[PDB]
Amino acid sequence: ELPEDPRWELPRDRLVLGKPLGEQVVLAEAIGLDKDKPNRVTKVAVKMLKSDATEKDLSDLISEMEMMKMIGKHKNIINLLGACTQDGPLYVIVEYASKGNLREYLQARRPPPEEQLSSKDLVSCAYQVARGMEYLASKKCIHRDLAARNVLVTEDNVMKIADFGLARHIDYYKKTTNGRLPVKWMAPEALFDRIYTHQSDVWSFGVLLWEIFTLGGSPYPGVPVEELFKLLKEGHRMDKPSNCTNELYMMMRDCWHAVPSQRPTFKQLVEDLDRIVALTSN
Ligand SMILES: Cc1nc2ccc(-n3ncc(C(=O)c4cc5ccccc5[nH]4)c3N)cc2[nH]1
């Protein structure tokens, strides 16, 4: 019983549903998504409700779609493409990232495609994520769960921020699909005082920087929740990755400032990474 929005509405028959992607998201083919090109197909990602869908789970999908409509377009985020709101279940149509999440993408390219990423490719990857986040921050949006698992990669190797429109009950002991604790990406003030800001997202970006330069490495391996809490209270910080400059590790450390006001902004991280990209050899 959703109202139609002709800005985004795609007839249900223009969407050829395919294989599942996300754990609910499916790969699909959209015919004539762009009005100027009606005889062309576009590979898209389709988000829809599960069988045991709650009325809150439905309201959250609507909120996510309405949020995506307002945020606007940027090259380094997953963009809204359309929606099927009439005569059936709600479908939210977004951009498809063929190469999947950043963590796997980096893991697949570790030394023994599988083609080794150069140091310029690594600094460029961080620059694109910083650019996506800078855009979201300018739109007054706080991610709250920034990590390489939530950075998706396109066929053209473009980094796009994903799952930024989430409406948030947080289980600290719950592990991800690969057995990792999300609390390892949380700023201490967000973790202990539940204070989520653009500054707490910058902290998460520091952990993401560490993920990039370890090629999908797991932060704090073998550290349980209770022991992580102790490390943070003591002011413990992760070690410099192997194959990481002192400048880029200083950047990580700045992102992890105990005082949120003293951390760099995404605007500053974009300018610094723009300069480092130009001075890094491929
Ligand atoms: C704010 C927001 N709403 C969203 C709604 C859905 C998605 N979303 N979820 C998955 C995907 C893929 O492209 C995708 C998954 C996958 C797995 C293996 C190989 C290739 C792949 N591509 C996507 N775009 C991100 C969203 N961000």
Swiss-Prot record:
Residues 15-282 form the Protein kinase domain. It is found in: Cell membrane; Nucleus; Cytoplasm, Cytosol; Cytoplasmic vesicle. Residues 1-282 are cytoplasmic. Changing Y173F: Reduced kinase activity. Loss of autophosphorylation and kinase activity. One of its GO terms (molecular function) is receptor-receptor interaction. Tyrosine-protein kinase that acts as a cell-surface receptor for fibroblast growth factors and plays an essential role in the regulation of embryonic development, cell proliferation, differentiation and migration. Required for normal mesoderm patterning and correct axial organization during embryonic development, normal skeletogenesis and normal development of the gonadotropin-releasing hormone (GnRH) neuronal system. Phosphorylates PLCG1, FRS2, GAB1 and SHB. Ligand binding leads to the activation of several signaling cascades. This is Fibroblast growth factor receptor 1. The lineage of its organism: Eukaryota, Metazoa, Chordata, Craniata, Vertebrata. The chain holds residues 464 to 763 of 822 of the full protein.
